[PDB]
Amino acid sequence: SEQESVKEFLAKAKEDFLKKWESPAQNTAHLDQFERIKTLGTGSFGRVMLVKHKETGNHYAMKILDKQKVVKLKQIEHTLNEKRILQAVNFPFLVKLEFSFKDNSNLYMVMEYVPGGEMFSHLRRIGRFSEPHARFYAAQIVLTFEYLHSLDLIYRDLKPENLLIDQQGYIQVTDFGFAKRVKGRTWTLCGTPEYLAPEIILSKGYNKAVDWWALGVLIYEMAAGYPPFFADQPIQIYEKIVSGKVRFPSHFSSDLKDLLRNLLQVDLTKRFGNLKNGVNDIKNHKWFATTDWIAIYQRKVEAPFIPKFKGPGDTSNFDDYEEEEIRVSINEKCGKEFSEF
Numbered sequence: 001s002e003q004e005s006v007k008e009f010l011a012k013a014k015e016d017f018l019k020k021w022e023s024p025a026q027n028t029a030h031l032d033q034f035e036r037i038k039t040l041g042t043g044s045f046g047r048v049m050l051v052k053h054k055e056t057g058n059h060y061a062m063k064i065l066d067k068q069k070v071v072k073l074k075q076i077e078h079t080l081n082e083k084r085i086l087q088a089v090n091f092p093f094l095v096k097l098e099f100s101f102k103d104n105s106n107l108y109m110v111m112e113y114v115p116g117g118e119m120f121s122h123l124r125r126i127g128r129f130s131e132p133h134a135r136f137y138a139a140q141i142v143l144t145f146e147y148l149h150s151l152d153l154i155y156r157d158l159k160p161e162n163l164l165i166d167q168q169g170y171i172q173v174t175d176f177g178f179a180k181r182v183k184g185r186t187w188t189l190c191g192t193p194e195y196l197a198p199e200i201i202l203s204k205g206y207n208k209a210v211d212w213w214a215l216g217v218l219i220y221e222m223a224a225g226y227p228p229f230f231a232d233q234p235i236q237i238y239e240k241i242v243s244g245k246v247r248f249p250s251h252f253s254s255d256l257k258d259l260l261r262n263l264l265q266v267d268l269t270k271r272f273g274n275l276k277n278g279v280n281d282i283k284n285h286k287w288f289a290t291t292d293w294i295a296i297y298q299r300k301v302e303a304p305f306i307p308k309f310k311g312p313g314d315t316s317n318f319d320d321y322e323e324e325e326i327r328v329s330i331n332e333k334c335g336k337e338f339s340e341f
């Protein structure tokens with residue numbers, strides 16, 4: 001009964017997703033319609049900027065990708081996935097893509113600006129979250145993965161850096177740069193070293209269970225203040241990941257440790273989230289016994305904290321990055337590669 005209504009919700013959610021999946025939205029827009037305010041994040045082929053839309057005064061977070069760098073780093077399909085998926089999803093804990101466009105040089109995804117900053121910065125600052133606090137965030141990720149996986153979407157980059165804290169103290173998942181729609185198995189080596197499942201490292205065909213592994217890492221990191229597998233060199237991190245060995249801080253409850261042993265299960269076929277009972281093994285776990293799943297979805301649970309809000313356009317919750325020019329070439333770069341964008 002509790003389950004039939006979940007089933008109902010999911011079927012409806014799929015209907016909606018497919019309508020947008022099958023005919024993606026397209027805009028319409030130019031870089032010169034925006035004032036750049038601050039770089040919020042950078043990477044090897046793009047960056048994220050706080051911008052103000054001049055005509056309306058609206059603030060947005062604009063992901064800007066350099067087409068030539070995308071192509072050179074063979075990320076074409078991934079950027080296409082990211083735009084197509086983000087425009088089609090609709091869920092309380094997923095960042096909203098407002099619109100997308102492209103010009104001669106760049107691809108643009110204009111998201112709702114979440115001024116609260118990354119969970120990563122808040123976690124690092126406080127040191128660690130209490131189990132009730134970690135559980136509040138974890139429950140939102142569980143619901144979000146239940147949503148995503150029913151749509152055959154694998155997220156593939158869970159980490160506190162990608163979890164924005166909104167003005168209600170709830171999560172907004174951002175960065176769909178590695179998300180993929182795929183039934184069954186996929187093979188790409190992608191993600192973040194500390195968060196990689198063993199089967200990604202071992203170069204196997206892997207599935208949605210990698211997202212549940214990643215949830216184990218996240219819960220561990222939220223509650224300990226550091227990830228379960230760390231070392232100086234990536235190779236050293238990978239050896240630890242595939243070993244089947246993980247130590248817990250002495251303050252972890254026995255219920256938490258039991259959940260983590262089942263999420264950080266190196267054998268994907270025994271990993272929670274990936275057994276016959278699917279997500280319900282997780283949702284029914286003793287560690288989540290006090291979680292009101294529907295109250296979480298409805299945002300009715302008092303959040304552990306609400307980020308300091310200094311008005312529209314405040315960036316105090318983000319780190320400073322070196323501000324670099326955004327170039328727009330006279331000539332169109334990589335036209336055919338990005339025609340579906």
Ligand SMILES: C[C@@H](NC(=O)CCCCCNC(=O)[C@H]1O[C@@H](n2cnc3c(N)ncnc32)[C@H](O)[C@@H]1O)C(=O)NCCCCCC(=O)N[C@H](CCCNC(=N)N)C(=O)N[C@H](CCCNC(=N)N)C(N)=O
Nearest residue numbers: 040041042043044045046047048061111112113114161174
């Ligand atoms: C795939 C390719 N993509 C690209 O080049 C395209 C552009 C992507 C920008 C991503 N950032 C972002 O997207 C950030 O922008 C904000 N943001 C995004 N959307 C937003 C929105 N709607 N509203 C507001 N802000 C938003 C958020 O701050 C978000 O984190 C790329 O290279 N993507 C970047 C991923 C590789 C970085 C290596 C690393 O671990 N770097 C960090 C140092 C940089 C610190 N960055 C952040 N804190 N965000 C690092 O080494 N950190 C380690 C720990 C890493 C392990 N993580 C753990 N949790 N343990 C460290 N020790 O500090």
